[PDB]
Amino acid sequence: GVVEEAHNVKVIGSGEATVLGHGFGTDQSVWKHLVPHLVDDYRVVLYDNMGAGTTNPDYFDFDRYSNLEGYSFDLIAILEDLKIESCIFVGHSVSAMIGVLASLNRPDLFSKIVMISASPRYVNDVDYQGGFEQEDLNQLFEAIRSNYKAWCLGFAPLAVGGDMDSIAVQEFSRTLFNMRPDIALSVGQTIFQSDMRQILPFVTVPCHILQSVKDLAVPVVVSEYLHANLGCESVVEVIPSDGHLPQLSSPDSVIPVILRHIRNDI
């Protein structure tokens, strides 16, 4: 169907036991080192967020995606079209919050959410550390629109972490620059200025909160904030890894942690 085509949906396997959503600047390929260990036990569903470089820019409705809710509607639509009545949802970065929002509307569709590199709020205030002051964000946005290619080349090593010459850095630079520059600026603004803190107490689906100990966009205190304020049962595990896309750049240390949280309930 057109929704599935538009999001490059892939379904690997069959059966009841069953979804992985990616973060800004990448696409479903971010899961390449995780998927091989899932396909024997689960029906695996991959999809791309609207606005990813692998998607048609004509379908990027700026009003629809001006709030994270637009993306959660897309997720629910995919689940409905595939006739999935229950899934484990694994969300990277913004997709963790997209999954959370989707679970507020349709908690019946999710048995568990596993979050990788998640944050409900990036901007600091006097009683909250998200990692960024508004002035930092303003300069980032300014850099994006002034020269997108240059911004991508400087940002990718920082976001990915590790060696600046790595395959993961090269690959993230590529998917980042694959986004149309106006869409990249708009999505960046929407995400980096989001605030999901206030809805956390309303979450009912259990959540596993995982992140790298060194993450450019997610201070460790954010994981504890999520744990303290989510209304569901939750658990946190901070991984001895570097990077915002650790499942791609450091799979040997990260994949075993993600698998434990997928396979084991709280």
Ligand SMILES: Cc1c2ccocc-2oc1=O
């Ligand atoms: C989520 C996220 C960010 C949030 C705020 O600033 C820079 C970021 O780079 C990212 O990948």
